[PDB]
């Protein structure tokens, strides 16, 4: 998934 | 709170990540990891499951996992999270  | 949602301050420092993966499920922006080793982890404020419903007052249902990277890479300080816890 997308890392913030 | 407002479905069932919690208020949580969030620390957001320019060019250092939160420490937290997001995925979109269905209209809704979902935590799926808390990095090892990460500022997340080190809060203890966010959670795998917790759904993100605004970031600084913007409604964040229906955005894309970009989108909010993106508005977040434009944000620094001390955030205003609302989560619903899972």
């Known amino acids: 998934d997308l890392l913030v | ?12 420092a320019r060019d250092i990540p ?3 993966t997001v995925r979109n499920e269905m ?3 979902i935590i799926s990891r808390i990095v090892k080793g990460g500022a997340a982890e080190k809060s203890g404020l966010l959670h795998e499951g917790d759904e993100v419903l605004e970031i600084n007052g ?3 249902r229906g955005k ?3 989108e909010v990277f993106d ?3 434009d ?3 001390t955030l205003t ?4 816890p899972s």
């Open chain 2, 18 to 20: 939160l420490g937290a």
């Open chain 2, 64 to 66: 894309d996992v970009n």
């Open chain 2, 58 to 60: 913007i409604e964040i």
């Open chain 2, 27 to 29: 209209d809704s922006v």
């Open chain 2, 81 to 84: 999270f609302v989560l619903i």
């Open chain 2, 1 to 12: 709170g407002p479905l069932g949602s919690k208020i949580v301050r969030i620390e957001k």
């Open chain 2, 75 to 77: 944000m620094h300080g």
């Open chain 2, 71 to 73: 508005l977040l890479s």
